[PDB]
Amino acid sequence: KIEEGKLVIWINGDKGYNGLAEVGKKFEKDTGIKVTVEHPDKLEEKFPQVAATGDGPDIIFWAHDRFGGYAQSGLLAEITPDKAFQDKLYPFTWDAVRYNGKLIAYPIAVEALSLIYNKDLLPNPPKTWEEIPALDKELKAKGKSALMFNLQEPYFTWPLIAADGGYAFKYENGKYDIKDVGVDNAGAKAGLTFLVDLIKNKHMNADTDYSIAEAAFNKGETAMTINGPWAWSNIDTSKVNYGVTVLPTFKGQPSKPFVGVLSAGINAASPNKELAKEFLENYLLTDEGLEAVNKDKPLGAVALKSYEEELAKDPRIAATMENAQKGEIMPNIPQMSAFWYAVRTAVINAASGRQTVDAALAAAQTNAAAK
Amino acid sequence: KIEEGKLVIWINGDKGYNGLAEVGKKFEKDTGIKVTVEHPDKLEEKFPQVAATGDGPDIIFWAHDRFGGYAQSGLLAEITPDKAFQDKLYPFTWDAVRYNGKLIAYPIAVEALSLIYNKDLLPNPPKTWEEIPALDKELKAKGKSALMFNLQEPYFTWPLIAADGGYAFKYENGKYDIKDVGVDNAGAKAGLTFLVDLIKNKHMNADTDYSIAEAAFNKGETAMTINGPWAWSNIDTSKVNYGVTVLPTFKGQPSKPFVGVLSAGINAASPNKELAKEFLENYLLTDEGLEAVNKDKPLGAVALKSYEEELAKDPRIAATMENAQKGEIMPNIPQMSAFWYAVRTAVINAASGRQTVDAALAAAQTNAAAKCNTATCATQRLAEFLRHSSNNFGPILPPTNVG
Ligand SMILES: OC[C@H]1O[C@H](O[C@H]2[C@H](O)[C@@H](O)[C@@H](O)O[C@@H]2CO)[C@H](O)[C@@H](O)[C@@H]1O
């Protein structure tokens, strides 16, 4: 049986299992729990045999595809990494370890075939499969051949077969169910009710608009406001000891703000398309260009890598980045417009007693879904 | 309308439009095309109204959430940035401007609401929403109020609404369709016909297996081969000057290799599930962890963004990761077993001439797509299975190695 207070790990005998023992070691050091790394023969065959009885390793390392049957046989626990951790890994890897919508393993490595060419014999490798016969007829003249690879395993021949539209099984990509809208479920009620309770007790005030908030906070007239980076500069100019922290919790759950990516689109009816492409690529989305905008109003965590690695040292950006990981990125589907529209008049009517919280959110559901 | 040889730019009123205007200065100093930076009210409702007529700005600035609606209205042009430029921007910011497969804008910055407070008025910031009633009563006497944010835009009120269960549209994760298998469709028949043609024209030999191609390449007999990271070590000690690049395209489209993702799963019967979680997330899936494994034996490309950026660099890994991203993830569904032995027979029969390309792939197709569940169709699949169940069971001597 699996021993509590200790980690046993299985991994194939052709992997860097000694280096893994090193890692399990630094772990045993800092926490005082031994980590043994083993590599049994036929481990892909042995694991489901013993893990069914309650035995086996705590962690097992194998190619992701074999994990589907493991999860089918109830041998793998569902994996619970936060959004902060999932960002660290590539998104397609998380798809390789999803079975029945649940994450069942941590991806480690990525494997794929490549074209390997002889620099001496072929310093300019071909870019199209079509130009290999011509290259071969030429290379055959010097007693050589252009291409030789394993033809007896479909793992090696599939890249060519799959190029023009072959596939094993069709994978339906991710999407938003525009018929499953959640603006009148229990959680949405508790939130909006709480906000409308904050005005039934005079703690807030209904027609408080954007400018009233900026003025009142930048006059030491209120203890806190909620806003994004663009409004930081005017609080510098107001000389106020402002801090930027994580949003408060509601019912022990963090506030989930919608995350926007400021974006620049080129109009389709513009005759000056290339000049706009030149302005954004070579003047704005540059280290010097983004700084020009950022010193007017703070941009946030920019998309350009170079400049972001500099602004990331700002503790308030890392606070903004922290709050972004607690929230969701916004969809870009056309129905986003009807959602914002509906929720807007829901919050207002509920906030001014024009409609009850329940009735306002109820009307918001239909308007977000059918329009 | 919009006139040629200028740029009209619309950004929102609360952004840094003066600083953006100065970027139009430098654009007009060097490129001297006039740049007018505007900021109308209700900017995102105004843009599709005028751009439908052919009016509006040249460039429009907003959060990504509106651009798909603009795109479905036929108002935005497809963004055509080259590969060199795409690597300067974070890959997930591009995701925000992808719509129906195409990019429709340039990502600029990530925006998120935060709680900002008044240190000299409040020492420690609160942690719960349910405790501001106390802070407010404690404060209304001292002179002022606690919270005051914009209640006219739902963008500001939403973080609280979503906290306990509110959401816009439930994200339904992607999955496979076991009814839709494509081993005998036009694309597969095209690529396989091309492969068999190489054999017919004696550019390749249908008997070539793994060990032949490795020797022929590691001895300078053939210019190229197709292999994985596991085979690099043998090419090293062969003293062949080899490079590893992207796979050749066919019919203008990239070759799609199967992608294998080495993964660490936690035993469902483990009593140490968080110890495993702490070990994998905080110790192994770091730069130091993967490097310790990679130094013992190469992982190839890794799934950790931070350590993969450093690993390639190595052009062999950069190509391995690029071919992977262009390829097909191995499906983890039980039907893959049929695909594996049916396609294997399919390719061999076609390259050897026993079956036409069309007929070989059609045979593997019905083996992987059930569809028909009458006894005639089921016993046919039963019969084909019992023959790909090769009966060895005897000892393999010497055993496949380990040490
Ligand atoms: O409130 C609805 C509104 O929310 C978002 O707009 C944000 C925008 O992302 C920020 O850059 C800043 O301007 O604050 C705005 C809220 O007033 C959505 O982007 C927008 O589509 C939506 O209408």
Q: Give the 3-state secondary structure of chain B.
A: CCCCCEEEEECCCCCCHHHHHHHHHHHHHHCCCEEEEECCCCHHHHHHHHHCCCCCCCEEEEEHHHHHHHHHCCCECCCCCCHHHHCCECHHHHHHCEECCEECCEEEEEECCEEEEECCCCCCCCCEHHHHHHHHHHHHCCCCEEECCCCCCHHHHHHHHCCCCCEEEEEECCEEEEEEEECCCHHHHHHHHHHHHHHHCCCCCCCCCHHHHHHHHCCCCEEEEEECHHHHHHHHCCCCCEEEECCCEECCEECCCEEECEEEEEECCCCCHHHHHHHHHHHHCCHHHHHHHHHHCCCCEECEHHHHHHHCCCHHHHHHHHHHHHCEECCCCCCHHHHHHHHHHHHHHHHHCCCCHHHHHHHHHHHHCCCCCCHHHHHHHHHHHHHCCCCCCCCCCCCCCCC
- Across the interface, do A268 and B129 touch by the CB < 8 Å criterion? no
- Main-chain dihedrals φ then ψ at residue B11, nearest 5 degrees: -120, 165
How many residues in chain A? 371
Determine, yes or no, domain membership for B287: yes
Q: Which of B149, B178, B205 to mutate to test the interface with A (most CBs of A within 10 A)?
A: B149
- Across the interface, do B60 and A265 touch by the CB < 8 Å criterion? yes
Q: Is the dihedral of CA B362, B365, B369, B375 positive or negative?
A: positive
| Nearest protein Cα to ligand 1, atom 22 | A340
Residue whose structure tokens are 């593997």: B364
Residues 6+ apart with CB under 8 A from A150: A156, B208, B209, B210, B213, B226
**Distance (Å) from the C-alpha of residue A301 to the closest C-alpha of chain B?**
5
Q: What share of chain A is helix, strand, coil (3-state, %, to 5)?
A: 45, 20, 35
Q: Are residues A15 and A86 in the same domain?
A: yes
> What single letter denotes the amino acid at residue B200?
K
Distances (CA, A) of A337 to A258, A268, A363, B156: 14, 20, 16, 16
Determine, yes or no, domain membership for B267: no
The rounded distance, in Å, linking the Cα atoms of A136 and A141 is 8
The rounded distance, in Å, linking the Cα atoms of A224 and B145 is 9
Nearest CA to B181 out of B345, B377, B369 is that of B369
Q: Which atom of ligand 1 is nearest to the CA of A262?
A: 11
Residues of A in contact with B17 (CB under 8 A): 296
Q: At what angle do helices B336-352 and B357-368 cross, to 10 degrees?
A: 170
| Nearest protein Cα to ligand 1, atom 15 | B155
How many residues in chain B? 403
- Main-chain dihedrals φ then ψ at residue A68, nearest 5 degrees: -60, -45
**Distance (Å) from the C-alpha of residue A199 to the closest C-alpha of chain B?**
11
Q: For residue B126, how far is its CA from the centre of ligand 1 (angstroms)?
A: 26
Asked if residues B76 and A334 have their Cβ atoms less than 8 Å apart, the reply is no
The rounded distance, in Å, linking the Cα atoms of B38 and A124 is 50
Determine, yes or no, domain membership for B110: no
Residue whose structure tokens are 């090696």: A156
CA angle A94–A99–A100, rounded 5-degree value: 125
- Could you give the number of structural domains in chain B? 4
The dihedral over CA atoms of A308, A287, B101, B64, expressed in degrees to the nearest 10, equals 70
The rounded distance, in Å, linking the Cα atoms of B91 and B88 is 9
**Distance (Å) from the C-alpha of residue A44 to the closest C-alpha of chain B?**
12
Asked if residues A270 and B51 have their Cβ atoms less than 8 Å apart, the reply is no
The rounded distance, in Å, linking the Cα atoms of B287 and B313 is 15
The rounded distance, in Å, linking the Cα atoms of A367 and A342 is 6
Residue whose structure tokens are 């890249």: A159
Q: Is the dihedral of CA B307, B311, B313, B318 positive or negative?
A: negative
The resolution in angstroms reads: 2.9
Three-state secondary structure of A237-273: CCCCCEEEECCCEECCEECCCEEEEEEEEEECCCCCH
B328-329 and B258-259 beta bridge pairing:
parallel
- Main-chain dihedrals φ then ψ at residue A227, nearest 5 degrees: -165, 175
Q: Are residues A98 and A118 in the same domain?
A: no
Q: Are residues B207 and B72 in the same domain?
A: no
Asked if residues A47 and A10 have their Cβ atoms less than 8 Å apart, the reply is yes
Asked if residues B227 and B298 have their Cβ atoms less than 8 Å apart, the reply is no
Nearest CA to A11 out of A39, A35, A34 is that of A39
A102-103 and A98-99 beta bridge pairing:
antiparallel
Nearest CA to B351 out of B157, B200, B250, B160 is that of B200
Asked if residues B149 and A248 have their Cβ atoms less than 8 Å apart, the reply is no
Nearest CA to A198 out of A320, A355, A326, A347 is that of A347
Q: Are residues A96 and A165 in the same domain?
A: no
The rounded distance, in Å, linking the Cα atoms of A98 and B263 is 11
Give the residue on B whose Cα is nearest the Cα of A68. Answer: B332
Residues 6+ apart with CB under 8 A from A55: A1, A2, B269
Give the residue on A whose Cα is nearest the Cα of B85. Answer: A281
Asked if residues A247 and A323 have their Cβ atoms less than 8 Å apart, the reply is yes
Asked if residues B97 and B106 have their Cβ atoms less than 8 Å apart, the reply is yes
Q: Are residues B141 and B56 in the same domain?
A: no
Size of interface A-B (CB pairs under 8 A): 1004
> What single letter denotes the amino acid at residue A242?
Y
Q: Are residues A84 and A143 in the same domain?
A: no
Q: Is the dihedral of CA A63, A67, A69, A75 positive or negative?
A: positive
Determine, yes or no, domain membership for A258: no
Asked if residues B20 and B31 have their Cβ atoms less than 8 Å apart, the reply is no
Q: What residue ranges line ligand 1, CB within 6 angstroms?
A: A 260, 340; B 12, 14, 63, 65-66, 111, 153-155
DSSP conformational letter for A173: P
- Main-chain dihedrals φ then ψ at residue A166, nearest 5 degrees: -75, 150
Give the residue on B whose Cα is nearest the Cα of A251. Answer: B164
In the numeric block, which tokens belong to residue A350?
A: 């509920």
Residues 6+ apart with CB under 8 A from A276: A266, A270, B7, B58, B59
CA angle B169–B170–B173, rounded 5-degree value: 130
The rounded distance, in Å, linking the Cα atoms of A283 and A294 is 14
Q: For residue B79, how far is its CA from the centre of ligand 1 (angstroms)?
A: 23
- Across the interface, do B114 and A178 touch by the CB < 8 Å criterion? no
C-to-N gaps above 2.5 Å in chain B, after residues = none
Q: Are residues A118 and A93 in the same domain?
A: no
Asked if residues A39 and B403 have their Cβ atoms less than 8 Å apart, the reply is no
DSSP conformational letter for A304: B
Nearest CA to A41 out of A15, A63, A17, A13 is that of A13
Q: Is the dihedral of CA B299, B301, B304, B310 positive or negative?
A: positive
Q: Helix or strand or coil: residue A315? A: helix
- Across the interface, do A112 and B258 touch by the CB < 8 Å criterion? yes
Burial class (CB in 10 A: 0-12, 13-18, 19+), B16: buried
Determine, yes or no, domain membership for A25: yes
Nearest CA to A332 out of B19, B42, B105, B11 is that of B105
Give the residue on B whose Cα is nearest the Cα of A227. Answer: B113
In the numeric block, which tokens belong to residue B257?
A: 């290799």
Distances (CA, A) of B198 to B194, B250, B251: 6, 13, 15
- Across the interface, do A58 and B266 touch by the CB < 8 Å criterion? yes
Burial class (CB in 10 A: 0-12, 13-18, 19+), B62: buried
Nearest CA to B67 out of B36, B32, B95 is that of B95
Q: Are residues B95 and B120 in the same domain?
A: no
The rounded distance, in Å, linking the Cα atoms of A229 and A301 is 9
Determine, yes or no, domain membership for A233: no
DSSP conformational letter for A141: T
CB atoms within 10 A of CB B79: 21
The structure was resolved experimentally with X-ray
Asked if residues B189 and B357 have their Cβ atoms less than 8 Å apart, the reply is yes
The shortest CB-CB distance from B299 to any of A80, A109, A129 is to A109
The rounded distance, in Å, linking the Cα atoms of A109 and B261 is 6
In the numeric block, which tokens belong to residue A357?
A: 């919280």
The residue range of the domain holding B81 is 6-103
Asked if residues B1 and B58 have their Cβ atoms less than 8 Å apart, the reply is no
| Nearest protein Cα to ligand 1, atom 3 | B155
Q: Are residues B57 and B96 in the same domain?
A: yes
Where residue B21 sits, what CATH number does that domain have? 3.40.190.10
Q: Are residues A121 and A81 in the same domain?
A: no
Asked if residues A339 and B170 have their Cβ atoms less than 8 Å apart, the reply is no
Asked if residues A276 and B2 have their Cβ atoms less than 8 Å apart, the reply is no
- Main-chain dihedrals φ then ψ at residue A102, nearest 5 degrees: -110, 140
Distances (CA, A) of B107 to A124, B77, B98, B313, B327: 35, 15, 10, 25, 26
End position of a domain, from candidates A55, A72, A103: A103
The rounded distance, in Å, linking the Cα atoms of A66 and B264 is 11
DSSP string, A42-94: THHHHHHHHTTTT-S-SEEEEETTHHHHHHHTT-BPPP---HHHHTTB-HHHH
Residues of A in contact with B109 (CB under 8 A): 229, 261-262, 290, 299-303
Q: Are residues B11 and B71 in the same domain?
A: yes
Residues 6+ apart with CB under 8 A from A294: A302, A311, B16, B19
- Residue A90 has, within 13 A of its CA and on its CB side, a CA count of 20
> What single letter denotes the amino acid at residue A168?
A
End position of a domain, from candidates A132, A149, A171: A171
| CA-derived radius of gyration, chain B | 30
Nearest CA to A264 out of B27, B51, B96, B60 is that of B60
The shortest CB-CB distance from A332 to any of B1, B68, B259 is to B68
CB atoms within 10 A of CB B216: 19
DSSP conformational letter for A202: T
Nearest CA to B286 out of A67, A101, A6, A30 is that of A30
The rounded distance, in Å, linking the Cα atoms of A347 and B301 is 48
Residues 6+ apart with CB under 8 A from A247: A226, A254, A255, A257, A323, A326, B113, B114, B115, B159
- Across the interface, do A149 and B227 touch by the CB < 8 Å criterion? yes
**Distance (Å) from the C-alpha of residue B234 to the closest C-alpha of chain A?**
13
End position of a domain, from candidates A79, A103, A127: A103
DSSP conformational letter for A230: G
Determine, yes or no, domain membership for B266: no
Which helix or strand (DSSP H or E) is residue A8 part of?
strand A7-11
The rounded distance, in Å, linking the Cα atoms of A47 and A58 is 11
> What single letter denotes the amino acid at residue B76?
L
The rounded distance, in Å, linking the Cα atoms of A22 and B365 is 47
Determine, yes or no, domain membership for A54: yes
Q: Are residues B364 and B245 in the same domain?
A: yes
CB atoms within 10 A of CB A272: 21
